[PDB]
Short mmCIF file of C-alpha atoms in Angstrom, two decimals:
data_model
loop_
_atom_site.label_atom_id
_atom_site.label_comp_id
_atom_site.label_asym_id
_atom_site.label_seq_id
_atom_site.Cartn_x
_atom_site.Cartn_y
_atom_site.Cartn_z
CA UNK A 1 -5.53 46.95 -172.42
CA UNK A 2 -5.78 44.63 -171.06
CA UNK A 3 -3.82 42.27 -168.96
CA UNK A 4 -6.07 39.46 -170.58
CA UNK A 5 -6.27 40.53 -173.72
CA UNK A 6 -2.58 39.88 -173.38
CA UNK A 7 -2.58 36.61 -172.17
CA UNK A 8 -3.79 35.25 -175.28
CA UNK A 9 -1.95 36.86 -177.21
CA UNK A 10 0.91 35.04 -175.42
CA UNK A 11 -1.14 31.77 -175.06
CA UNK A 12 -1.25 31.79 -178.68
CA UNK A 13 2.01 32.50 -178.96
CA UNK A 14 3.31 29.44 -177.26
CA UNK A 15 1.05 26.71 -178.50
CA UNK A 16 1.86 23.55 -178.62
CA UNK A 17 5.68 24.44 -176.17
CA UNK A 18 6.52 21.81 -173.91
CA UNK A 19 8.68 24.06 -171.92
CA UNK A 20 9.15 27.60 -171.70
CA UNK A 21 11.47 29.54 -169.57
CA UNK A 22 10.03 33.15 -167.38
CA UNK A 23 12.95 35.11 -168.66
CA UNK A 24 11.64 33.63 -173.01
CA UNK A 25 7.42 34.84 -171.26
CA UNK A 26 9.08 38.06 -169.74
CA UNK A 27 10.52 39.31 -172.98
CA UNK A 28 7.08 37.83 -175.65
CA UNK A 29 5.24 39.81 -172.67
CA UNK A 30 6.95 43.24 -173.42
CA UNK A 31 6.24 42.58 -177.36
CA UNK A 32 3.35 41.87 -176.41
CA UNK A 33 1.90 44.65 -174.54
CA UNK A 34 3.97 46.70 -177.70
CA UNK A 35 1.12 44.89 -180.62
CA UNK A 36 -1.60 45.56 -177.63
CA UNK A 37 -0.53 49.53 -176.37
CA UNK A 38 0.77 50.32 -178.43
CA UNK A 39 2.50 54.06 -177.41
CA UNK A 40 0.41 53.72 -174.04
CA UNK A 41 3.25 51.52 -173.99
CA UNK A 42 5.30 54.58 -171.83
CA UNK A 43 2.11 54.75 -169.30
CA UNK A 44 2.98 50.98 -168.79
CA UNK A 45 4.98 49.68 -164.96
CA UNK A 46 7.10 46.69 -164.05
CA UNK A 47 4.69 44.94 -162.49
CA UNK A 48 1.98 44.74 -166.08
CA UNK A 49 4.60 42.33 -166.63
CA UNK A 50 4.72 40.79 -163.10
CA UNK A 51 1.50 39.43 -163.57
CA UNK A 52 1.26 38.39 -167.01
CA UNK A 53 4.49 36.05 -166.73
CA UNK A 54 2.52 34.79 -163.73
CA UNK A 55 0.38 34.51 -166.09
CA UNK A 56 1.75 31.07 -167.03
CA UNK A 57 4.31 30.08 -165.36
CA UNK A 58 2.93 30.63 -160.83
CA UNK A 66 -2.18 27.02 -171.14
CA UNK A 67 -0.25 27.01 -168.49
CA UNK A 68 3.05 26.01 -167.80
CA UNK A 69 2.57 25.58 -163.59
CA UNK A 70 5.88 23.18 -162.93
CA UNK A 71 9.68 23.63 -163.10
CA UNK A 72 12.74 21.59 -164.03
CA UNK A 73 16.38 22.87 -163.44
CA UNK A 74 19.29 22.11 -166.03
CA UNK A 75 21.64 23.84 -164.43
CA UNK A 76 21.43 27.25 -164.27
CA UNK A 77 18.36 27.38 -166.00
CA UNK A 78 15.10 26.84 -164.23
CA UNK A 79 12.44 25.79 -166.97
CA UNK A 80 8.07 25.37 -167.33
CA UNK A 81 6.19 22.11 -168.82
CA UNK A 82 2.35 21.73 -168.86
CA UNK A 83 1.02 18.58 -166.08
CA UNK A 84 1.79 15.77 -168.00
CA UNK A 85 2.79 17.02 -170.96
CA UNK A 86 6.74 15.62 -170.91
CA UNK A 87 9.77 17.49 -172.05
CA UNK A 88 12.59 15.39 -175.09
CA UNK A 89 15.19 17.50 -175.97
CA UNK A 90 13.18 19.04 -179.01
CA UNK A 91 12.40 20.86 -176.11
CA UNK A 92 14.98 21.51 -174.10
CA UNK A 93 16.66 22.65 -177.51
CA UNK A 94 14.34 25.10 -178.33
CA UNK A 95 13.39 26.76 -174.99
CA UNK A 96 17.52 26.95 -174.26
CA UNK A 97 17.44 28.64 -178.01
CA UNK A 98 15.10 30.82 -177.18
CA UNK A 99 16.43 31.52 -172.87
CA UNK A 100 20.14 32.45 -174.61
CA UNK A 101 18.02 35.08 -177.41
CA UNK A 102 15.67 36.64 -174.29
CA UNK A 103 18.38 36.72 -171.75
CA UNK A 104 20.84 38.28 -174.59
CA UNK A 105 17.66 41.01 -174.29
CA UNK A 106 17.33 41.26 -170.44
CA UNK A 107 20.64 41.74 -169.56
CA UNK A 108 21.13 44.93 -172.89
CA UNK A 109 18.48 46.53 -171.14
CA UNK A 110 19.36 48.27 -168.53
CA UNK A 111 22.30 49.43 -170.57
CA UNK A 112 20.06 50.47 -173.47
CA UNK A 113 18.77 52.53 -171.76
CA UNK A 114 21.58 54.79 -170.22
CA UNK A 115 23.06 54.65 -173.91
CA UNK A 116 19.50 56.26 -175.45
CA UNK A 117 18.95 58.32 -172.37
CA UNK A 118 23.21 60.01 -172.63
CA UNK A 119 21.94 60.64 -176.21
CA UNK A 120 19.18 62.23 -175.80
CA UNK A 121 19.94 64.66 -173.51
CA UNK A 122 19.32 66.31 -171.42
CA UNK A 123 15.78 66.08 -173.30
CA UNK A 124 13.34 65.00 -170.44
CA UNK A 125 12.10 61.01 -170.54
CA UNK A 126 9.26 58.56 -168.79
CA UNK A 127 9.01 55.32 -169.89
CA UNK A 128 10.51 51.75 -168.75
CA UNK A 129 9.02 49.65 -171.95
CA UNK A 130 8.63 52.27 -174.53
CA UNK A 131 10.66 55.48 -173.65
CA UNK A 132 10.12 58.72 -174.70
CA UNK A 133 12.39 62.18 -175.57
CA UNK A 134 11.28 65.56 -174.78
CA UNK A 135 13.60 69.07 -175.29
CA UNK A 136 11.63 71.91 -177.38
CA UNK A 137 8.04 70.12 -178.69
CA UNK A 138 10.40 67.73 -179.96
CA UNK A 139 9.32 63.96 -179.36
CA UNK A 140 11.36 60.88 -179.95
CA UNK A 141 9.86 57.25 -179.50
CA UNK A 142 12.70 54.20 -178.38
CA UNK A 143 10.78 50.31 -178.14
CA UNK A 144 14.25 48.31 -177.10
CA UNK A 145 14.07 45.11 -178.38
CA UNK A 146 16.79 42.76 -180.78
CA UNK A 147 16.99 43.02 -184.00
CA UNK A 148 15.74 38.82 -184.62
CA UNK A 149 12.31 40.21 -182.46
CA UNK A 150 12.51 42.67 -184.78
CA UNK A 151 12.15 41.02 -187.57
CA UNK A 152 9.13 39.22 -186.56
CA UNK A 153 7.17 42.85 -185.13
CA UNK A 154 8.59 43.99 -188.07
CA UNK A 155 4.90 44.77 -189.16
CA UNK A 156 3.93 46.84 -185.33
CA UNK A 157 6.89 48.86 -185.64
CA UNK A 158 5.89 50.32 -189.45
CA UNK A 159 2.36 51.50 -188.24
CA UNK A 160 3.74 52.78 -184.41
CA UNK A 161 6.09 55.84 -187.00
CA UNK A 162 2.83 57.35 -187.99
CA UNK A 163 0.81 56.93 -184.17
CA UNK A 164 3.22 59.05 -182.24
CA UNK A 165 3.71 62.72 -181.83
CA UNK A 166 7.42 62.16 -182.69
CA UNK A 167 9.62 60.18 -184.33
CA UNK A 168 9.82 56.34 -183.40
CA UNK A 169 12.94 54.51 -183.04
CA UNK A 170 13.38 50.73 -182.47
CA UNK A 171 16.51 49.93 -179.88
CA UNK A 172 18.20 47.03 -180.99
CA UNK A 173 22.02 45.37 -179.12
CA UNK A 174 24.72 44.76 -181.20
CA UNK A 175 24.43 40.71 -182.22
CA UNK A 176 27.66 38.40 -183.16
CA UNK A 177 26.78 37.33 -186.55
CA UNK A 178 25.98 39.26 -189.39
CA UNK A 179 22.93 36.79 -190.71
CA UNK A 180 19.94 39.09 -187.96
CA UNK A 181 20.92 42.17 -189.18
CA UNK A 182 21.64 41.33 -193.28
CA UNK A 183 17.85 39.46 -193.47
CA UNK A 184 16.26 42.66 -192.35
CA UNK A 185 17.75 44.59 -194.00
CA UNK A 186 17.61 42.39 -196.84
CA UNK A 187 13.64 41.91 -196.74
CA UNK A 188 12.68 45.63 -194.71
CA UNK A 189 15.70 48.47 -194.77
CA UNK A 190 13.03 49.40 -198.06
CA UNK A 191 10.04 49.18 -195.91
CA UNK A 192 11.73 50.63 -192.50
CA UNK A 193 12.75 53.98 -195.22
CA UNK A 194 9.65 54.04 -196.83
CA UNK A 195 7.41 54.59 -193.60
CA UNK A 196 9.92 56.20 -192.12
CA UNK A 197 11.47 53.49 -188.81
CA UNK A 198 14.24 54.13 -187.24
CA UNK A 199 16.53 51.65 -185.82
CA UNK A 200 19.83 52.80 -183.90
CA UNK A 201 22.37 49.85 -182.46
CA UNK A 202 23.58 49.56 -178.90
CA UNK A 203 27.06 48.41 -178.04
CA UNK A 204 26.45 47.72 -174.68
CA UNK A 205 30.01 47.14 -173.28
CA UNK A 206 31.38 50.17 -174.74
CA UNK A 207 27.68 51.48 -174.22
CA UNK A 208 27.95 52.93 -177.84
CA UNK A 209 25.18 53.77 -180.26
CA UNK A 210 25.00 53.38 -183.50
CA UNK A 211 21.80 53.99 -187.17
CA UNK A 212 21.05 50.91 -188.28
CA UNK A 213 18.02 52.99 -190.26
CA UNK A 214 17.63 55.97 -190.30
CA UNK A 215 18.67 59.28 -188.66
CA UNK A 216 17.13 62.20 -186.07
CA UNK A 217 16.26 65.27 -187.87
CA UNK A 218 18.20 67.76 -185.87
CA UNK A 219 21.94 67.87 -185.88
CA UNK A 220 22.76 68.28 -183.01
CA UNK A 221 22.68 65.10 -181.75
CA UNK A 222 24.38 62.99 -184.53
CA UNK A 223 27.39 63.83 -181.51
CA UNK A 224 26.08 61.18 -179.62
CA UNK A 225 26.27 58.27 -182.43
CA UNK A 226 30.05 56.51 -182.63
CA UNK A 227 30.53 56.15 -185.70
#
């Protein structure tokens, strides 16, 4: 905990912003919850994230402006200009992509880990014969930014820690991570696996399980 401390971390990330979306707040709330709780995130329910997001929308983005099918939120007499909507929109796309992929990722990862027993939503813990895997669901751009969190996470769990991210359309997201952090990831033993939400497949980007019986579950 606490819910208050997560709401304080979220309010640091959004300082100076004139517009946000609920899906952006929701995504960054899961990432702040991780930063503050680490492994204890396996015990967190969706209701913590509901309460955190409603901190910020219902620093305080109280006032609604609808642009097409997207609901933006802004402060009281702070007026969002084009540039603020454009950034809020870039963040909405990023966040919606993760959020749309989220449940398919947990389906594909469960299927990879059968029949390990499974618990958790935002971090998911898989256990079979006293052997544990810990899966955090994110995106590669987030993982890039949150890399210090993930590097420390590998030593904090009794088992293997894996970040599960979706496929991207461009090369740069995965390519810039490789250039900047692949060696740090290897040295720390951080695993990152890639889910195709369309094809319902999973593939390693960085790192492998330590059981040949799981290697069956990868696409290529």
